[PDB]
Amino acid sequence: PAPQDVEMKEEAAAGSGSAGEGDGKAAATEHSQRELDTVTLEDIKEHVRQLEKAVSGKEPRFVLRALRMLPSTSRRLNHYVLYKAVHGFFTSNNATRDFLLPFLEEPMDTEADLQFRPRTGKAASAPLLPEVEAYLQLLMVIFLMNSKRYKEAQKISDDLMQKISTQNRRALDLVAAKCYYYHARVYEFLDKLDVVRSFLHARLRTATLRHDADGQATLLNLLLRNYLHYSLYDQAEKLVSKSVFPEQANNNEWARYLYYTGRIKAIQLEYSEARRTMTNALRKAPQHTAVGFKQTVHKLLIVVELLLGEIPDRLQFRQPSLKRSLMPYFLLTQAVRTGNLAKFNQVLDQFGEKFQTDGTYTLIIRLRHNVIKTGVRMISLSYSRISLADIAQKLQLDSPEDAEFIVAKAIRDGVIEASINHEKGYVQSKEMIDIYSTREPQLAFHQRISFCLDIHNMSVKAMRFPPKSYNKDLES
Amino acid sequence: MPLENLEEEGLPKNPDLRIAQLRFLLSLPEHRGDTAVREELMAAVRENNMAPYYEALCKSLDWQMDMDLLSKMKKANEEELKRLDEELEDAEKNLGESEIRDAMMAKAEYLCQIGDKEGALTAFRKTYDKTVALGHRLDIVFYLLRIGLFYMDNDLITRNTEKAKSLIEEGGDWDRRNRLKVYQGLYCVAIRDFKQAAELFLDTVSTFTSYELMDYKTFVTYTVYVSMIALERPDLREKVIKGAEILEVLHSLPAVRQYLFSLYECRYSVFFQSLAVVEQEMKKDWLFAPHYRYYVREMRIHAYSQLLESYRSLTLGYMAEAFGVGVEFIDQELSRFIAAGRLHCKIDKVNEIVETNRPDSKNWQYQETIKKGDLLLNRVQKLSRVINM
């Protein structure tokens, strides 16, 4: 039948998860636990096993088929992703589950280390019991975020995943830490008025008491994403500053943090820094899990780069092959370059609704300073002494006098750097025609030397950690 | 030899004198039996009219297909089709190696003429595969390559030129090398890398005597346009102007020769009006360039460079007259060009100095180091991120 074919792969899924739990339980093996847990296992569990072969009715077959309700409720947790009490909360195509025929296979392998017989479910006290429970939830959450489940299922995730846990450990908190972040993205997507932020805050207190590196990193990045949606600026600003955000973090974590920090910085008139992190973020983000947030980074970033006075290329639009969705941003790119306001104001209002979703709209209005700035910027840098009159004819500014105030303000900001001599009336470039007399070639090299040294210190410590973890746990 | 066809395509691409070439272009598919194929070659021409055919319009300047062009095509495919079948039958009778590959080429030509481009490419691979000498394999690649160059579809051209070059030493197919040199230069112009074309073409003339490929004289003329565009004067000076190639031909060179003479004389009013002349006669006569915008940027930046290189100061009037291009234009181009640092200059318009920061100074060597250096940090970060987890 249909669940028999995918049965081979369920034993495979169980092999990787069971081991992962095992590792965690013996002291601090933390580094090896987080790489396994996130993009690597997940890309396989969902896509290869369930979707590709077909049969998504192997997910609540995986976390139940014994009839475990667990000593602290998690029976519901398993239902809601798939097979609510009917055939499919998305895709069924299963003739055996725990509400169709109990048992057909054991991914549970008759030992508490993912799942185990009903004897655990009704009551246990074992030290294997928290370890299976935290783990139980990671396995479930994997289909939730990929398939983009919604509704009530989304609302009840939070309850089971935290306020059943307020005591964990470092091993357990790490697993839970990953589960909360995936649910949080699924939550964000629906654009429900029911507070995403509130749960994520409650989860933070538990993260902090165990003092688990992982818990702080995951929650914090999501908490910023939540904050942007509501559009309550002050809290996110403080929260970003508090995040130390560890150097030993998963790839998806790295791309998402830089991305949030960029959104926050862009409105602020810290656009030079915002644009670098946002460009980086797109590259760093994967091909599979990342896709919802990923879209949003490329759309926002095009506006953010303009804010610095960068003129973004056509290759940028064509190459990921999203050019259609990007088409309006493309229009802003043209408008910024020309130096004339009329085209920029018109586009801002017309696409206004579409921009607001992505969270661009607050950044779009800031470009009005930038429309003129980007055009005066090319002209001031290129030439030496040029008249305000040249700037105004080319750019289509109102007056040379108008153009004179505008250049003055920019040199104060210092992203065009010049000194104006309104005698004859030219704007003058800064330039020394030798930078060897100045420290600047040395200072440039020296900065690299600090940046380089950081890589050496990071590498020596990181290198031994996974083989060490493997030694205690025993390797074949 | 089919290099003439590429010269027909090219002149309409920039919309100036298109009219006469359009007609000449149309005549070539009658001979071949290329009706369908023509629409594909037409694509390469883009940024001008090429749409009218007997199977389409008759309104625009590009020439109508004849009733005869169509009929000839019907004949040619029937005949090709007859050859293919006939060639196999002869193959059973005698040697396997030579005869069978000739048969597969018949099949590719047949599909290529009706317009089944995909079909032609699978057949063409078959040809390549079949056991014959390496020398013979090369002969089969040169036809598809020329056809590839016509459409200016990048993929086809890459494959052929690249394998063709390998074979030369290994087989010992030095005799084929002559056709191949010219073919390498065609590839080289075809990508937006005019830089490669300038070194490649100059070599091509000396090693070439003859072996089934376009005239000696034609190349020399073509060598001058690539040489100038890419090369700055000290390189240019040694190679072409002192070198043999350009002098021996003598005649048929005046547009290009006027450029070199003016550049020697170093009167920039004279050089700039000859830039324009060599752009209209020579440069537009090539279809080549997957983005034309790159070709235009390189000719302007080169001429500009020469003028700026010779002088740390010029008055604005001398510089502005010398270019002959507008205040609006000079400025508009200058902003893009300066970034590169091939020019590395700035305009003091109100005192009237055209100053040059110098592209030979410390300021330059710095601009490059910093520009490369910063991007490398971003990169160490992307690599580093994957490795930890």
Partner: peptide
């Protein structure tokens, strides 16, 4: 985005012949 130089080609050739006389 797209280079303004292309649009410049047709305009720049013609300018040259007139300009030299017009301005010194």
């Amino acid at each position: 985005n797209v280079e303004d130089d292309f649009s410049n080609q047709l305009r720049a050739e013609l300018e040259k012949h007139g300009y030299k006389m017009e301005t010194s």
